[PDB]
């Protein structure tokens, strides 16, 4: 019985925590019972170890799954092989294997902060939510790390435990923190996940602008219309002015723009006629998009808010758009498509235009004979209509062209399925919206009589369903693992053994089995009124996280909450990319979502309430329900006149994660209130005009007396009638449903936060508000920072005492002085995750071989000296060194010189041979380097030395940035001396004394250039010359120092070169404590771009960073730092061990003139203490 026997489909990817499910189908020509064993093998260091395995017995004519056990989540990117072996009772039947791609995303995490914009002296409250792939809660140990934009580790929590996946943590910011995008990192299992939140100086806006405009606009349209809605947070309309800039984005023309300035009361309509886009199509061939910018200024405060939208311009009045069409042509089957014909402005299509028929031209070409057919179709009321036309059997390319009233659309389908029997099937879906649990219908059509169909459903690179359907139409029920995109592959085998298949990719909308509903007790409430928030969940023993914030937090255009969009983005992150194969007849159709097939089937009169409490985050609740499905939490409404927006999430062990469908709003509003137009920061002594806006929303115009309370922290400039208080009260008239503004000149006289109490009294109502102004100090801000390294790596000494002093300038503004002291146990280095991307194959020419070779050596030396090198990366690294060493040894000539092309170039380069000697000398503890090659390079470099010691280059260097290091011969001598000066390991008799005398003479005449000076300093520090100290001192004199920063800026990569060379000069002269600002400059010049830029400064920078780590390579740290002195009445103690070695611990000291501290370190290791002084001058 010849024919097909088996068909085994296994996915080509593997993720940790996901079961590798394969599908086995046994056919008519196979025996009764076939035992299928699937093995997973890990290939490390040319050892293949069977990690996971499973076995099963399958019967003839049955389609079942063989499921492997789950991979552990601790695994990494190793070589994985899947081997499938199907056996009979006395003989094997198939035995094959493949490679598997690895995906690093194993679990889901959500970092929810209460807001994304934070003021200084605030508190960040956040939750870490750890879930599985099927959104069940995950219990694990993890680390939380909060860092500044300068990437110093400021806060950390080590080995926290998650109670049902939710971790609630808080973090108090400093008084003056580093402004910018702070980062929260979670190191769960072996993966780091990031979440950025901004810390800046901002004032919360009290209203929002929405701009309702059509997305498209026709050129033949007479008017472009739109609506502007400026609305307060508490729901009242905004009375103000609008400036409207209609600006074409044509870069060919000028900045011509229509401007329209008018008035707005809540909502306002605008329209532009053709005399307002007459400058627009003058400026624009095809027209580009235009920008409509709205600036609304509130007429009582002057606070302006601007929004912008983009409008695309279409040349025709109607747009004809297509969907629901197969991307692969199927011969002898009906092509179906759905057409939306809509107007440009988005309005409904009129009954007059419905009489015009859409002319659709089909063009089937055998790519060269073509068949062209024009069909007329009617248009419905909604404008969405389906077309269906047959396809001829020889058609290879289909061209569709639709015309309607001059509007044209066209596309072409070129992908043709080829079959020897010319038998094809088509799988189509009828439901536009597919959800989880709702069954959806599938229709299978074919040009011939169909056999028993077999369907396989694959989602997230995992085969999640199998089965056999005999009917040509069947219903399938999606599950939670099908999200977001599912492959339904429907196939059957003909009598000659040919597989006939179709693959349908469908988006599956995720529904949640767990539901959480939030209800306020009231829709509208007053401030300081007790309301109740009711939480209703689906299941008991659930943990509920509730956030309820100000609406202006949502109006800050930044949010870090857990919503449906983040869940959809994480589900799209679960989806992966796929690769290609050899495409026998349908294996591309199989591999459309990553499937690898094994088969043989192809062969042959009261005081007002004083409003003081103004928070931005009202409710930050983290509770456990226990036995309750609903709970009522009683809260007090704060004093902010706004709307409070509440959302939340629920986590249960049975159902998983659940989210609120809509945010629920509570309106905190009173009809008579006070608004203070305040900036964030005022300087002390400056007279600023406080703007008090009395908002009256009653039905009558009221005479309001505004009374500001006296304080000793500020002065009111204008006087009052009485002598008890100056500027005590003012009188004004506020209209009904409007606001009025009164100015008060205020001169603050004290630093810090100052309270202002404003009381508005009317015969109808009253209000009182107490608000904080942050008053800073006048003058110009200056910063000083001094760093001291305390070294305890030697076990002879145990206590080290150092002194740090600073004297203030005499023109310092009093009260502006701030003294901080930070202690760290280790420096911030390059991150290992990006540096693993910096290791590569040595390829190309010899200079390209060095470009792909040398940073691998210096990165391997750096993580060898930092003790963070994994074994697989190590074996890959030394494999790269061996192959790069062989590729560089291909380019060695007969005289020992090296070049880019080897023997093809006429003369070799001295600089490239020096680079060869330096890289091969560094690589010699790691790989085996032949000493005759190194001796030949010594003799060829020594043969190019003159009598004075000056060296000369007869060769050529192709690359610019390799030759960009200063072609003057003094740099050549210094580079060849610092490359030849590592050669003392083998023999120590190197006579470069004439060259050292030449470099000392070149230093003695006086150097203007700067890289050259750093190279002379490194050479003289390496030989231990007496002129090295003067050169390093004058190079430190040439350095720019600011903010604990020492660097060199060239007036014309080279800055990193001079910083690393002077750093190695400081290390070789035992001035380790002075290299710390340069080391911080090296730490800061690599944060935004991963590793180090280019290669030539990358090598020297990682050499200096590994040379620091080799000097302080003690893995045990137990350092106690005690800070005493006149500036500290209590001794400040920092404890540094191996866990908090990266923690930048900080402490604040009193202001004593002059500021002097004594820092005593006791223990073992090394520590760095930095004294920072911030002062304002006049
Ligand atoms: C866009 O706004 C303009 C505002 O002028 C509208 O033009 C007016 O339309 C009404 C109703 O047809 C006429 O009675 C007026 O005489 C028109 N005013 C003019 C031309 O200045 C226009 O209809 C609006 N278009 C849309 C699509 O809403
Ligand atoms: C719209 O165009 C006008 C010019 O027709 C711009 O007005 C000038 O703008 C510049 C830059 O702000 C000012 O320096 C001039 O004093 C303005 N003069 C006039 C005559 O208005 C206007 O700024 C444009 N609007 C936008 C937002 O692009
Ligand atoms: C070598 O680097 C130093 C920086 O340390 C350069 O000196 C700076 O020159 C600029 C531009 O005129 C000044 O604004 C700085 O004040 C200087 N800083 C210091 C620390 O002196 C110097 O110019 C560089 N040399 C060359 C040849 O580029
Ligand atoms: C801080 O360090 C200084 C310098 O070590 C200490 O200086 C003292 O100076 C007086 C001068 O008469 C000597 O008599 C002391 O013996 C010194 N003490 C030493 C050397 O430790 C100073 O006392 C230290 N104390 C504080 C808290 O500032
Ligand atoms: C893997 O199989 C086990 C065994 O039943 C099951 O509990 C687990 O949920 C499966 N995991 C996935 C991701 O399907
Ligand atoms: C299994 O491996 C062999 C050896 O390369 C190969 O010839 C064959 O095509 C593979 N597949 C099957 C189904 O035997
Ligand atoms: C703006 O146009 C809409 C659409 O007809 C209309 O309902 C609304 O009243 C208009 N607003 C103003 C202020 O004219
Ligand atoms: C609004 O205007 C200010 C001041 O020019 C500008 O800083 C801000 O970016 C603008 N915002 C928008 C959304 O255009
Ligand atoms: C294609 O559509 C026409 C018109 O409804 C119908 O007669 C024909 O049977 C269809 N063919 C297939 C294969 O569905
Ligand atoms: C479509 O309408 C045009 C114009 O009336 C006519 O010339 C053409 O023959 C029509 N085509 C069909 C298929 O009815
Ligand atoms: C599938 O349906 C056909 C048509 O009725 C029938 O002949 C065949 O036996 C069915 N196969 C199975 C396995 O039910």
Coordinates of N, CA and C in Angstrom, one line a residue, residues 450-597:
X450 N -14.5 17.6 -1.4 CA -13.6 17.7 -0.2 C -13.7 16.4 0.6
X451 N -12.5 16.0 1.1 CA -12.5 14.8 2.0 C -12.6 15.3 3.5
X452 N -12.3 14.4 4.4 CA -12.3 14.8 5.8 C -11.2 15.8 6.1
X453 N -11.6 17.0 6.4 CA -10.7 18.1 6.6 C -10.0 18.0 8.0
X454 N -8.8 18.5 8.1 CA -8.1 18.6 9.4 C -7.6 20.0 9.6
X455 N -8.0 20.5 10.8 CA -7.6 21.9 11.1 C -6.7 21.9 12.3
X456 N -5.7 22.8 12.2 CA -4.7 23.0 13.3 C -4.7 24.5 13.6
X457 N -4.8 24.9 14.8 CA -4.8 26.3 15.3 C -3.6 26.6 16.0
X458 N -2.8 27.6 15.6 CA -1.5 27.9 16.2 C -1.6 29.4 16.6
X459 N -1.2 29.7 17.8 CA -1.1 31.0 18.3 C 0.1 31.2 19.2
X460 N 0.7 32.4 19.1 CA 1.9 32.8 19.8 C 3.1 31.9 19.5
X461 N 3.2 31.3 18.3 CA 4.2 30.3 18.0 C 4.0 29.0 18.7
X462 N 2.8 28.7 19.1 CA 2.5 27.4 19.8 C 1.2 26.8 19.2
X463 N 1.3 25.5 18.9 CA 0.1 24.8 18.3 C -0.9 24.6 19.5
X464 N -2.0 25.3 19.5 CA -2.9 25.3 20.6 C -4.1 24.4 20.3
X465 N -4.4 24.0 19.1 CA -5.6 23.2 18.9 C -5.4 22.3 17.6
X466 N -5.9 21.1 17.7 CA -6.0 20.2 16.5 C -7.4 19.7 16.4
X467 N -7.7 19.1 15.3 CA -9.0 18.4 15.1 C -9.3 18.1 13.7
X468 N -10.3 17.2 13.5 CA -10.8 16.8 12.2 C -12.3 17.2 12.1
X469 N -12.6 17.9 11.0 CA -13.9 18.3 10.7 C -14.3 17.7 9.3
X470 N -15.5 17.0 9.3 CA -15.9 16.4 8.1 C -16.8 17.4 7.2
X471 N -17.4 18.3 7.9 CA -18.2 19.3 7.1 C -17.4 20.4 6.5
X472 N -18.0 21.1 5.5 CA -17.3 22.2 4.8 C -17.5 23.5 5.6
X473 N -18.2 23.5 6.6 CA -18.5 24.7 7.4 C -18.5 24.3 8.9
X474 N -17.8 25.0 9.7 CA -17.7 24.5 11.1 C -17.5 25.7 12.0
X475 N -17.8 25.6 13.3 CA -17.7 26.6 14.3 C -16.6 26.3 15.3
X476 N -15.7 27.3 15.6 CA -14.6 27.1 16.5 C -14.8 28.1 17.7
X477 N -14.3 27.6 18.9 CA -14.4 28.4 20.1 C -13.0 28.9 20.5
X478 N -12.7 30.2 20.4 CA -11.3 30.6 20.8 C -11.2 30.6 22.4
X479 N -10.0 30.4 22.8 CA -9.6 30.5 24.2 C -8.7 31.6 24.5
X480 N -8.3 31.7 25.8 CA -7.4 32.8 26.2 C -6.0 32.7 25.6
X481 N -5.6 31.5 25.2 CA -4.3 31.3 24.6 C -4.2 31.7 23.1
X482 N -5.4 31.9 22.5 CA -5.5 32.2 21.1 C -5.1 33.6 20.7
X483 N -5.1 34.5 21.8 CA -4.9 35.9 21.6 C -3.4 36.2 21.3
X484 N -3.1 37.2 20.5 CA -4.0 38.1 19.7 C -4.3 37.6 18.3
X485 N -3.4 36.9 17.6 CA -3.5 36.4 16.3 C -3.5 34.9 16.2
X486 N -4.4 34.3 15.6 CA -4.5 32.9 15.5 C -4.4 32.4 14.0
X487 N -3.6 31.4 13.8 CA -3.6 30.7 12.5 C -4.5 29.5 12.5
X488 N -5.5 29.5 11.6 CA -6.2 28.3 11.3 C -5.7 27.7 10.0
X489 N -5.1 26.5 10.1 CA -4.6 25.9 8.9 C -5.5 24.7 8.7
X490 N -6.1 24.7 7.5 CA -7.1 23.6 7.1 C -6.4 22.9 6.0
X491 N -6.3 21.6 6.1 CA -5.6 20.8 5.1 C -6.3 19.4 4.9
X492 N -6.1 18.8 3.8 CA -6.4 17.4 3.5 C -5.6 16.9 2.4
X493 N -5.5 15.5 2.3 CA -4.6 14.8 1.4 C -5.4 14.1 0.4
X494 N -5.0 14.4 -0.9 CA -5.7 13.7 -2.0 C -5.2 12.3 -2.2
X495 N -5.7 11.6 -3.2 CA -5.3 10.2 -3.4 C -3.9 10.0 -4.0
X496 N -3.4 11.0 -4.6 CA -2.0 10.9 -5.1 C -1.0 11.4 -4.0
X497 N -1.4 11.7 -2.8 CA -0.6 12.1 -1.8 C -0.3 13.6 -1.6
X498 N -0.8 14.4 -2.5 CA -0.6 15.9 -2.4 C -1.4 16.5 -1.3
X499 N -0.7 17.3 -0.4 CA -1.3 18.0 0.6 C -1.9 19.3 0.1
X500 N -3.2 19.6 0.4 CA -3.9 20.8 0.0 C -4.3 21.5 1.3
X501 N -3.8 22.7 1.4 CA -3.8 23.5 2.7 C -4.2 24.9 2.4
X502 N -4.7 25.6 3.4 CA -4.9 27.0 3.4 C -4.6 27.4 4.9
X503 N -4.1 28.6 5.0 CA -3.8 29.2 6.3 C -4.6 30.6 6.4
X504 N -5.3 30.7 7.5 CA -6.1 32.0 7.7 C -5.6 32.6 9.0
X505 N -5.1 33.8 9.0 CA -4.7 34.6 10.1 C -5.8 35.5 10.6
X506 N -6.3 35.3 11.8 CA -7.4 36.1 12.3 C -7.0 36.8 13.6
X507 N -7.4 38.0 13.8 CA -7.2 38.7 15.1 C -8.3 38.3 16.1
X508 N -7.9 37.9 17.3 CA -8.8 37.5 18.3 C -8.8 38.5 19.4
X509 N -9.9 39.1 19.7 CA -10.0 40.1 20.7 C -10.1 39.4 22.1
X510 N -9.2 39.9 23.0 CA -9.2 39.3 24.3 C -10.3 39.7 25.2
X511 N -11.0 38.8 25.8 CA -12.0 39.1 26.8 C -11.5 38.6 28.2
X512 N -12.0 39.2 29.2 CA -11.5 38.9 30.6 C -12.6 38.2 31.4
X513 N -12.2 37.0 32.0 CA -13.2 36.3 32.8 C -13.4 37.0 34.1
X514 N -12.4 37.8 34.6 CA -12.6 38.5 35.8 C -13.0 39.9 35.5
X515 N -14.1 40.4 36.2 CA -14.6 41.7 36.0 C -14.6 42.5 37.3
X516 N -14.3 43.8 37.2 CA -14.3 44.7 38.3 C -15.0 45.9 37.9
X517 N -16.0 46.3 38.8 CA -16.8 47.5 38.5 C -16.7 48.5 39.7
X518 N -16.6 49.7 39.4 CA -16.4 50.8 40.4 C -17.6 51.7 40.4
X519 N -18.2 52.0 41.5 CA -19.3 52.9 41.6 C -19.0 54.0 42.7
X520 N -19.2 55.3 42.3 CA -19.2 56.3 43.3 C -20.6 56.3 44.0
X521 N -20.6 56.9 45.2 CA -21.9 57.1 45.9 C -22.7 58.2 45.2
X522 N -22.0 59.2 44.8 CA -22.7 60.4 44.1 C -21.9 60.7 42.9
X523 N -22.6 61.4 41.9 CA -21.9 61.8 40.7 C -21.3 63.2 41.0
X524 N -22.0 64.1 41.6 CA -21.5 65.4 42.0 C -21.5 65.5 43.5
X525 N -20.3 66.0 44.0 CA -20.1 66.1 45.4 C -19.4 67.4 45.7
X526 N -19.5 67.9 47.0 CA -18.8 69.0 47.5 C -17.4 68.6 48.0
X527 N -16.5 69.5 48.1 CA -15.2 69.2 48.9 C -15.5 69.0 50.4
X528 N -14.7 68.2 51.0 CA -14.8 67.7 52.4 C -16.2 67.1 52.7
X529 N -16.6 66.3 51.8 CA -17.9 65.5 51.9 C -17.6 64.0 51.9
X530 N -18.1 63.3 52.8 CA -17.8 61.9 52.9 C -18.6 61.1 51.8
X531 N -17.9 60.5 50.9 CA -18.5 59.7 49.9 C -18.0 58.3 50.0
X532 N -18.6 57.4 49.2 CA -18.1 56.0 49.4 C -17.9 55.4 48.0
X533 N -16.8 54.7 47.8 CA -16.5 54.0 46.5 C -16.8 52.5 46.7
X534 N -17.6 52.0 45.8 CA -18.0 50.6 45.9 C -17.3 49.8 44.8
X535 N -16.6 48.7 45.2 CA -15.8 47.9 44.3 C -16.6 46.5 44.2
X536 N -16.9 46.1 43.0 CA -17.6 44.8 42.8 C -16.8 44.0 41.9
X537 N -16.3 42.8 42.5 CA -15.5 41.9 41.7 C -16.3 40.6 41.4
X538 N -15.8 39.7 40.6 CA -16.4 38.5 40.2 C -16.2 37.3 41.2
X539 N -15.0 37.2 41.8 CA -14.6 36.1 42.5 C -14.1 36.5 43.9
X540 N -14.3 35.7 44.9 CA -13.7 35.9 46.2 C -12.2 35.5 46.1
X541 N -11.5 35.8 47.2 CA -10.0 35.7 47.4 C -9.3 36.4 46.3
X542 N -9.6 37.6 46.0 CA -9.0 38.4 44.9 C -8.3 39.6 45.5
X543 N -7.3 40.1 44.9 CA -6.5 41.3 45.3 C -6.9 42.4 44.3
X544 N -7.3 43.5 44.8 CA -7.8 44.6 44.1 C -6.9 45.8 44.2
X545 N -6.4 46.4 43.1 CA -5.7 47.7 43.1 C -6.5 48.8 42.5
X546 N -6.7 49.9 43.2 CA -7.5 51.0 42.8 C -6.7 52.2 42.8
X547 N -6.8 52.9 41.6 CA -6.2 54.3 41.6 C -7.3 55.3 41.3
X548 N -7.3 56.4 41.9 CA -8.3 57.5 41.7 C -7.5 58.8 41.8
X549 N -7.4 59.5 40.7 CA -6.5 60.6 40.6 C -7.3 61.8 40.1
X550 N -6.6 63.0 40.1 CA -7.1 64.2 39.4 C -7.2 64.0 37.9
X551 N -8.1 64.7 37.3 CA -8.3 64.6 35.9 C -7.1 65.3 35.1
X552 N -6.5 66.3 35.8 CA -5.4 67.0 35.2 C -4.2 66.1 35.0
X553 N -4.0 65.1 35.9 CA -3.0 64.1 35.7 C -3.2 63.4 34.4
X554 N -4.4 63.0 34.1 CA -4.7 62.5 32.7 C -4.6 63.6 31.6
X555 N -4.7 64.8 32.0 CA -4.5 65.9 31.0 C -3.1 66.3 30.8
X556 N -2.2 65.7 31.5 CA -0.7 65.9 31.3 C -0.1 65.2 30.1
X557 N -1.0 64.5 29.3 CA -0.6 63.8 28.1 C 0.5 62.7 28.4
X558 N 0.4 62.1 29.6 CA 1.3 61.0 30.0 C 0.6 60.2 31.1
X559 N 0.6 58.9 30.9 CA 0.0 58.0 31.9 C 0.7 56.6 31.9
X560 N 0.8 56.1 33.1 CA 1.5 54.8 33.3 C 0.6 53.8 33.9
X561 N -0.7 53.9 33.7 CA -1.7 53.0 34.3 C -1.8 51.7 33.5
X562 N -2.4 50.7 34.1 CA -2.6 49.4 33.5 C -4.0 49.5 32.8
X563 N -4.0 49.6 31.5 CA -5.2 49.7 30.7 C -5.3 48.6 29.7
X564 N -6.3 48.6 28.9 CA -6.4 47.6 27.8 C -5.4 47.7 26.7
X565 N -4.9 49.0 26.5 CA -3.9 49.2 25.5 C -2.6 48.6 25.8
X566 N -2.2 48.7 27.1 CA -0.9 48.0 27.5 C -1.0 46.5 27.5
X567 N -2.2 45.9 27.7 CA -2.5 44.5 27.6 C -2.4 44.1 26.1
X568 N -2.9 44.9 25.2 CA -2.9 44.6 23.8 C -1.5 44.7 23.3
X569 N -0.7 45.7 23.8 CA 0.7 45.9 23.4 C 1.6 44.7 23.9
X570 N 1.3 44.2 25.1 CA 2.0 43.0 25.6 C 1.6 41.8 24.9
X571 N 0.4 41.6 24.5 CA 0.0 40.5 23.6 C 0.6 40.6 22.2
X572 N 0.7 41.8 21.7 CA 1.5 41.9 20.4 C 2.9 41.7 20.6
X573 N 3.5 41.9 21.8 CA 4.9 41.6 22.1 C 5.0 40.1 22.2
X574 N 4.0 39.3 22.6 CA 4.0 37.9 22.5 C 4.1 37.3 21.1
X575 N 3.6 38.0 20.1 CA 3.7 37.6 18.7 C 5.1 37.8 18.2
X576 N 5.5 36.9 17.4 CA 6.9 36.8 16.9 C 7.0 36.8 15.4
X577 N 8.2 37.0 14.9 CA 8.5 36.9 13.5 C 8.9 35.5 13.0
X578 N 8.8 35.3 11.7 CA 9.1 34.0 11.1 C 10.1 34.1 10.0
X579 N 10.6 32.9 9.6 CA 11.7 32.8 8.6 C 11.2 32.0 7.4
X580 N 12.1 31.7 6.5 CA 11.8 31.0 5.2 C 12.4 29.6 5.1
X581 N 12.1 28.9 4.0 CA 12.6 27.6 3.8 C 12.9 27.3 2.3
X582 N 12.6 26.1 1.8 CA 12.8 25.8 0.4 C 11.6 25.7 -0.4
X583 N 10.4 25.7 0.1 CA 9.1 25.8 -0.5 C 8.9 24.8 -1.6
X584 N 8.7 23.5 -1.2 CA 8.4 22.4 -2.1 C 7.0 22.6 -2.8
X585 N 5.8 22.5 -2.1 CA 4.7 23.1 -2.7 C 3.8 24.0 -1.8
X586 N 3.7 23.7 -0.5 CA 2.8 24.4 0.5 C 3.5 24.6 1.8
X587 N 4.9 24.5 1.8 CA 5.6 24.6 3.1 C 5.7 26.1 3.5
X588 N 5.6 27.0 2.5 CA 5.4 28.4 2.9 C 4.1 28.7 3.5
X589 N 3.0 28.0 3.1 CA 1.7 28.1 3.7 C 1.7 27.6 5.1
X590 N 2.5 26.5 5.3 CA 2.8 26.0 6.7 C 3.6 27.0 7.5
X591 N 4.6 27.6 6.9 CA 5.6 28.4 7.7 C 5.1 29.9 7.9
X592 N 3.9 30.2 7.4 CA 3.3 31.6 7.5 C 3.2 32.0 9.0
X593 N 3.0 31.1 9.9 CA 3.1 31.4 11.3 C 4.1 30.5 12.1
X594 N 5.2 30.1 11.4 CA 6.2 29.4 12.1 C 5.9 27.9 12.4
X595 N 5.8 27.1 11.4 CA 5.5 25.7 11.6 C 6.4 24.9 10.7
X596 N 6.9 23.8 11.2 CA 7.9 22.9 10.5 C 7.3 21.5 10.4
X597 N 7.1 21.0 9.2 CA 6.3 19.8 9.0 C 7.2 18.6 8.7

